[PDB]
Design an enzyme around this catalytic site. Structure first.
Site, PDB file in Angstrom:
ATOM      1  N   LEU C  35       0.660  -1.190  -0.282  1.00 43.14           N
ATOM      2  CA  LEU C  35      -0.401   0.443  -0.312  1.00 43.14           C
ATOM      3  C   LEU C  35       0.625   0.991   0.153  1.00 43.14           C
ATOM      4  O   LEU C  35       1.827   1.400   0.137  1.00 43.14           O
ATOM      5  CB  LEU C  35      -0.725   0.583   1.490  1.00 43.14           C
ATOM      6  N   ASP C  36       0.603   2.304  -0.596  1.00 36.21           N
ATOM      7  CA  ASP C  36       0.623   3.469  -0.668  1.00 36.21           C
ATOM      8  C   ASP C  36       0.778   4.455  -0.308  1.00 36.21           C
ATOM      9  O   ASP C  36       0.223   3.561   1.008  1.00 36.21           O
ATOM     10  CB  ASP C  36       0.530   4.325  -2.573  1.00 36.21           C
ATOM     11  N   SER C  37       1.540   5.482   0.881  1.00 41.02           N
ATOM     12  CA  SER C  37       1.244   6.804   1.523  1.00 41.02           C
ATOM     13  C   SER C  37       0.141   7.493   1.672  1.00 41.02           C
ATOM     14  O   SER C  37      -0.196   7.594   2.726  1.00 41.02           O
ATOM     15  CB  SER C  37       3.049   7.837   1.227  1.00 41.02           C
ATOM     16  N   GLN C  40      -2.228   4.554   3.045  1.00 40.81           N
ATOM     17  CA  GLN C  40      -3.106   3.939   4.376  1.00 40.81           C
ATOM     18  C   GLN C  40      -3.485   4.833   5.089  1.00 40.81           C
ATOM     19  O   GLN C  40      -4.378   5.023   5.995  1.00 40.81           O
ATOM     20  CB  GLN C  40      -0.898   4.497   5.075  1.00 40.81           C
TER      21      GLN C  40
END
Ligand SMILES: NC(=O)c1ccc[n+]([C@@H]2O[C@H](COP(=O)([O-])OP(=O)(O)OC[C@H]3O[C@@H](n4cnc5c(N)ncnc54)[C@H](OP(=O)(O)O)[C@@H]3O)[C@@H](O)[C@H]2O)c1
Ligand code: SF4
Ligand code: SF4
Ligand code: SF4
Lengths: 88, 176, 75, 106, 204, 111, 147
Positions: C35-37, C40
C-alpha cells in the site's frame, strides 16, 4: 377646470407659498444657441519677452530628502464657534 | 462653522407640550404631508413626448462616431494613429497604407461600439478634426455585426449627418 | 474482541487495494501488503467511518499494521 | 451638559489627576535611559502644571485638547494601556533587529 | 511666480523625522523619508502591532484613524510587497505613512487588535497579492470568485487572466470556465527616450 | 528570528492529513444538499488528482500557505456560498484537450 | 387565412402596448435607467411600469457591467422568466465591455451568458437613446407567427 387663475389659489393654500418658480421653469431667460462667437483670453504666457521655462519651473523641485535614519506635527486643530446665521 | 442638528426637547409646559401631543393623538402632519402632494398634482406635468417633442441638448455633444471630410471631396483623416493611442478603451483599430498616388491615408478603420466609453478624446486629439462626434441616438441594433462600425464604410455614411456636424463645429473653434 | 476482528477485515477487503490472500490479519500495509503513502491515509479513513469515527493524526503514524489498528480502535 | 461622542456626559475633576500620576510610575520601571521615558514626562508634567493652576475652567479644558474635559480624559485613558504595552514589549531601550537590503528608491 | 506651489510647513513637519527617530529602535525606524509635507516611514515586518499602538492615543501624536491600507507590488526587490499603512490625525490635522516590506510568502503581524477597520483591507491584500496575515479572524475572498486561481494583481500573470471566457454551452445549467481565448490587448511600446529629470539618476 | 506561518517541517504534513480528513467527509454534503451533478465516487477521485499535482514538498512555508488556501476554497462548500453548479466545478468537462505527442499536436496546431 | 393573420396582430399588440421590466442595477448605467422614471423623459407614458415584479416580468434590461461573480447570478434569473422574453443590453459594458474588456473579472458583453435582442450603445445611455430600448423594441415586434 384647467384655468391657471383658480388653480394658483389652491396650490398656494395647500402648504407653503408657491406661485413663482414653477415645476417646469423653462419659459423666460433660457438662451438658445448660447451667444455670438466669443474670444477666449490668454494667461500670463502668449505675450512675448521674459517667457522662459527657466523661470516657469513646473516639474523641477521634486527630489525627496532622507531624514535622520517635544514636537507637534502642527499647531492643534482649535474648534470653531457656532454659526451666526443659524444657532441650531 | 458648527451648525447643530438636535433641538434638545422644545416642549416645557402646557402650550408647547399639548400641540406636540396633538400630532400623535390625531395626525395633522399627515394632513401637512398631504398638502405638499396636493399642490404637486395641480401644477402641470413636465413630460416630453419622445417621437414628437425632443429633450434639450448642447452644441458640443458626444454620442455618434462619424469622420468628416473637406468641402471639395477628399477624406480628411490622415492615419496618424494619434486617436488610437489616446483611446482609453483601445476601441479604434487602424491600419495605414499609401494610396499609390503620394497621399497617406486609411485602409482599415474600425471603431467598435462593443468597446468605446464615448469619452470624446479622439474628437479632441485629432489635429485635422476628422472624427467629430455627431449628436445622434438612432443606432440600436439586433446583432453585434450590425453594431460595430466597419472600415470607413459606415463612418462615411456619417456624411448624412455632416450638415449638423458642420454647424455644431462652429462652437468648437473659439471654444463655446 | 470477535466483532473488531470481523468488521475491520471486511472493510479492508472491500477497498480492493489489496488481495484477500495478500492481507489476512497480521500482514502490515507499510511493506507486506503493498500500500502507498496516500493509501494508508485512505484505509484509516475507511476503517474509522465503518466502526466509529475517532481517529487523530498522532495515532495515524502508529496505525500501520491491521492487527495493531484493531487493538488501537478497541482500546 | 452634553458630550459629543458616546463618552459619558459628566466632568470628573481630579480623576484626570489620578490617571496622570499613575502613568508616571508606569514609565519608571524598565525605560530609564530610553527617550520614550524622556519625551512623555516633559509633556505630561507640562499638562499637570496647567490642570493644577486652573480648576473647572473652559479655557483649561481647551489647553491642547480642543473638545470637552471628558474627551481629554478619553485621550489619556488608553495612554495607560499604551504605557503598559511599552513595558511588556519594549523597543525603546534595545536596538538589535536586522537592517533591510539596500533598495528603497523608486 | 505663477504656476508652481509654495511650501512653508516642511520644516515644522520635518521635526517628526527626528521625533519618531529619537525613540530609536532597530526594531522599528530603519529609514525616514519626508517630501511635500508628507512623511514616509518604512518599518521592519516583525514589529507592526507595537508600532501602531504608538501614534495611537499618544499625547504628542494622536492619529486614531486608519484611512488607507494600500499595498505596493514591485518585482525589482527580493522583498516583493511594500504594504503602506496610511494614517490620518483629526486632532493635529496631519498625515503619516507606515510602510513595511514582505517577500514572496511570509506573514506580517496584522493590526486587528489595533484597528477595527483593518480586517476588511487585510482580506483585500490576501486576495489581490496573496500576502497571508497572522492573528487574523476569518480570512475570506471578497473581490475574487469562489473558484479563482492565482492572485488578481500580481505582475507575474497577464491582464486578461486565464479563466476569462464564460459560455452557456451544451450543458443546461453549468457555465464554462477553462477556455482561455480572448481578443488581443494592444500593448503599446510607449516609453520616451532621454531622461527628463535631474536629481533622480543613479550611477551604476 | 524567522516566520514559520503555522507549522515547522513535520507538523505541516499532519495539517494536510487533517485537511484530507475533513474534505473526504464533505463530498456527501456537496451532492445531497448542493446538487448530484456527477457522482460520489468521481467526487472523491477529484480530490486525489488535486493533491497529486502538489507532489513537490520542499518548504514548510509553501505547504502551510496551501493549507490556508485549502481552508478557503474547500471551506467555501462547507458553509455554502453562492456557486449553483456553475461555480465550484474544478474538473474541466466543456473543453476537450489535445494529447502530448509530436504527431498529434503538429497535425492540429501547437507552438 | 386573413382572420388568423389579423388575430396574430392583436397578440403582438398586447406586448407592443405593455412591457413590464426587471431592471438590473449593478452599474453607473443604473442611474440613467432611473432617469426613465424621471418626468422629463417619461416612460410610464407607455405600458411600462417600475413595479419590477421579478417572477412576473417580461423584458429584463441588463444595465452595465457583468462580472464573473454575477455571471451565474443573472443566468438563473433569465431561466425563471416567462417564455415571451426579451433582453436589452443597456450601456457599452453590457454590449461588449466598454471599459474592462481586457480585464480578468468582466464577462465580455452579456451575449456569452444570456442572448441579447436589442443593443443600447451609449456609455451614459442618454434617456433619448434609452427610448430606443422601448420604441425600437416595440417596432421590432412583427414575429410573423404563422402556425
Ligand atoms: N432521438 C430521436 O428522436 C431520434 C431518433 C432517431 C433519429 N433521429 C433523427 O435526428 C433528427 C433529430 O431532430 P429532432 O427530431 O430533434 O427535431 P425536432 O425537435 O422535431 O425539431 C425540428 C425543427 O426543424 C424544423 N423543420 C423540420 N422539418 C422541416 C421542414 N420540412 N421545413 C421547414 N422546417 C422544418 C422545424 O421548424 P418549424 O417548426 O419552423 O418548421 C422544427 O423546429 C431527426 O431529423 C431524426 O430523423 C432522432
Ligand atoms: S482620426 Fe484624426 S488623429 Fe485619428 S488617424 Fe485620422 S487624422 Fe489622425
Ligand atoms: S470617444 Fe473615447 S473611447 Fe470612444 S473611440 Fe473616441 S477616444 Fe476611444
Ligand atoms: S456603460 Fe458606462 S455608465 Fe454603463 S456601466 Fe459601463 S462604464 Fe458605467
Amino acid at each position: 377646470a384647467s384655468a391657471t387663475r383658480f388653480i394658483q389659489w389652491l396650490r398656494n393654500w395647500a402648504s407653503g407659498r408657491d406661485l413663482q418658480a414653477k415645476l417646469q421653469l423653462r419659459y423666460q431667460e433660457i438662451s438658445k444657441r448660447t451667444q455670438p462667437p466669443p474670444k477666449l483670453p490668454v494667461g500670463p504666457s502668449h505675450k512675448l519677452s521674459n517667457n522662459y521655462y527657466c523661470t516657469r519651473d513646473g516639474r523641477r523641485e521634486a527630489m525627496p530628502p532622507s531624514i535622520v535614519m517635544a514636537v507637534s506635527p502642527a499647531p492643534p486643530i482649535k474648534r470653531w464657534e457656532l454659526s451666526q446665521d443659524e444657532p441650531y | 462653522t458648527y451648525k447643530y442638528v438636535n433641538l434638545r426637547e422644545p416642549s416645557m409646559d402646557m402650550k408647547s407640550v399639548t400641540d406636540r401631543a396633538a400630532q400623535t393623538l390625531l395626525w395633522t402632519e399627515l394632513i401637512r404631508g398631504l398638502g405638499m402632494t396636493l399642490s404637486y398634482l395641480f401644477r402641470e406635468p413636465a413630460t416630453i413626448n419622445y417621437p414628437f417633442e425632443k429633450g434639450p441638448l448642447s452644441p458640443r455633444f458626444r454620442g455618434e462616431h462619424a469622420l468628416r471630410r473637406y468641402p471639395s471631396g477628399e477624406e480628411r483623416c490622415i492615419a496618424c494613429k494619434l486617436c488610437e493611442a489616446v483611446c482609453p478603451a483601445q476601441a479604434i483599430t487602424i491600419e495605414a497604407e499609401p494610396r499609390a498616388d503620394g497621399s497617406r491615408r486609411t485602409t482599415r478603420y474600425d471603431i467598435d461600439m462593443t468597446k468605446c466609453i464615448y469619452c470624446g478624446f479622439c474628437q479632441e486629439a485629432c489635429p485635422v478634426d476628422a472624427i467629430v462626434e455627431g449628436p445622434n441616438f438612432e443606432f440600436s441594433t439586433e446583432t453585434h455585426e450590425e453594431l460595430l462600425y466597419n472600415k470607413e464604410k459606415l463612418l462615411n455614411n456619417g456624411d448624412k449627418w455632416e450638415a449638423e456636424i458642420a454647424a455644431n463645429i462652429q462652437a468648437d473653434y473659439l471654444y463655446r | 474482541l470477535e466483532g473488531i476482528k470481523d468488521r475491520v477485515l471486511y472493510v479492508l477487503k472491500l477497498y480492493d487495494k489489496i488481495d484477500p490472500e495478500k492481507l489476512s490479519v497480521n500482514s502490515h500495509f507499510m511493506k507486506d501488503l503493498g500500500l502507498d503513502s496516500l493509501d494508508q491515509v485512505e484505509i484509516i479513513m475507511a476503517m474509522e467511518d465503518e466502526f466509529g469515527f475517532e481517529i487523530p493524526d498522532i495515532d495515524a503514524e502508529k496505525l500501520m499494521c491491521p492487527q495493531e489498528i484493531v487493538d488501537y480502535i478497541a482500546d | 451638559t452634553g458630550l459629543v461622542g458616546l463618552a459619558v456626559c459628566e466632568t470628573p475633576h481630579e480623576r484626570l489627576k489620578i490617571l496622570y500620576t499613575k502613568i508616571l510610575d508606569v514609565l519608571g520601571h524598565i525605560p530609564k535611559n530610553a527617550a520614550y521615558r524622556k519625551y512623555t514626562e516633559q509633556i505630561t508634567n507640562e499638562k499637570l502644571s496647567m490642570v493644577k493652576a486652573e480648576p473647572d475652567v473652559k479655557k483649561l479644558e481647551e489647553r491642547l485638547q480642543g473638545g470637552q474635559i471628558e474627551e481629554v480624559i478619553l485621550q489619556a485613558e488608553n495612554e495607560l494601556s499604551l504605557a503598559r504595552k511599552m513595558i511588556q514589549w519594549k523597543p525603546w531601550e534595545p536596538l538589535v533587529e536586522e537592517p533591510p537590503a539596500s533598495q528603497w528608491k523608486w | 511666480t505663477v504656476r508652481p506651489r509654495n511650501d512653508v510647513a516642511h520644516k515644522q513637519l520635518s521635526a517628526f523625522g527626528e521625533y519618531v527617530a529619537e525613540i530609536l529602535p532597530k526594531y522599528v525606524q530603519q529609514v525616514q523619508v519626508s517630501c511635500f509635507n508628507e512623511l514616509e516611514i518604512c518599518i521592519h515586518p516583525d514589529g507592526v502591532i507595537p508600532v501602531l499602538t504608538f501614534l495611537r492615543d499618544h499625547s504628542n501624536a494622536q492619529f486614531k484613524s486608519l484611512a488607507d491600507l494600500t499595498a505596493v507590488d514591485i518585482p525589482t526587490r527580493q522583498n516583493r510587497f511594500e504594504i503602506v499603512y496610511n494614517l490620518l490625525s483629526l486632532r493635529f490635522n496631519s498625515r503619516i505613512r507606515v510602510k513595511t516590506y514582505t517577500d514572496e510568502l511570509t506573514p506580517i503581524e496584522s493590526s486587528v487588535p489595533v484597528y477595527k477597520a483593518a480586517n476588511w483591507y487585510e482580506r483585500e491584500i490576501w486576495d489581490m497579492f496573496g500576502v497571508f496575515f497572522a492573528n487574523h479572524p476569518d480570512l475570506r475572498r471578497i473581490l475574487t470568485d469562489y473558484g479563482f486561481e492565482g492572485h488578481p494583481f500580481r505582475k507575474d500573470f497577464p491582464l486578461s487572466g486565464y479563466v476569462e471566457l464564460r459560455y452557456d454551452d451544451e450543458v443546461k445549467r453549468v457555465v464554462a470556465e477553462p477556455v482561455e481565448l480572448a481578443q488581443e490587448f494592444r500593448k503599446f511600446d510607449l516609453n520616451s527616450p532621454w531622461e527628463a529629470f535631474p536629481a533622480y539618476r543613479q550611477p551604476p | 528570528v524567522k516566520p514559520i506561518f503555522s507549522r515547522d517541517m513535520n507538523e505541516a504534513k499532519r495539517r494536510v492529513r487533517e485537511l484530507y480528513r475533513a474534505w473526504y467527509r464533505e463530498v456527501p454534503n456537496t451532492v445531497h444538499l448542493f446538487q448530484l451533478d456527477i457522482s460520489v465516487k468521481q467526487g472523491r477521485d477529484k480530490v486525489r488528482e488535486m493533491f497529486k499535482k502538489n507532489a513537490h514538498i520542499t518548504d514548510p512555508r509553501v505547504v502551510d500557505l496551501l493549507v490556508i488556501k485549502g481552508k478557503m476554497e474547500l471551506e467555501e462548500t462547507i458553509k455554502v456560498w453562492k456557486q449553483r453548479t456553475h461555480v465550484m466545478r474544478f474538473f474541466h468537462e466543456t473543453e476537450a484537450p489535445r494529447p502530448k505527442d509530436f504527431l498529434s499536436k503538429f497535425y492540429v496546431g501547437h507552438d | 387565412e386573413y382572420v388568423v393573420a389579423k388575430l396574430d396582430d392583436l397578440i403582438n399588440w398586447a406586448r407592443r402596448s405593455s412591457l413590464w421590466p426587471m431592471t438590473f442595477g449593478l452599474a453607473c448605467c443604473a442611474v440613467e435607467m432611473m432617469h426613465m422614471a424621471a418626468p422629463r423623459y417619461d416612460m410610464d407614458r407607455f405600458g411600462v411600469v417600475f413595479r419590477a415584479s421579478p417572477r412576473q416580468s417580461d423584458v429584463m434590461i441588463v444595465a452595465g457591467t457583468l462580472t464573473n461573480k454575477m455571471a451565474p447570478a443573472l443566468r438563473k434569473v433569465y431561466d425563471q422568466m416567462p417564455e415571451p422574453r426579451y433582453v436589452v443590453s443597456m450601456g457599452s459594458c453590457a454590449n461588449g465591455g466598454g471599459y474592462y474588456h481586457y480585464s480578468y473579472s468582466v464577462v465580455r458583453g452579456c451575449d456569452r451568458i444570456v442572448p441579447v435582442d436589442i443593443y443600447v450603445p451609449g456609455c451614459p445611455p442618454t434617456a433619448e437613446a434609452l427610448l430606443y430600448g422601448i420604441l425600437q423594441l416595440q417596432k421590432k415586434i412583427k414575429r410573423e407567427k404563422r402556425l
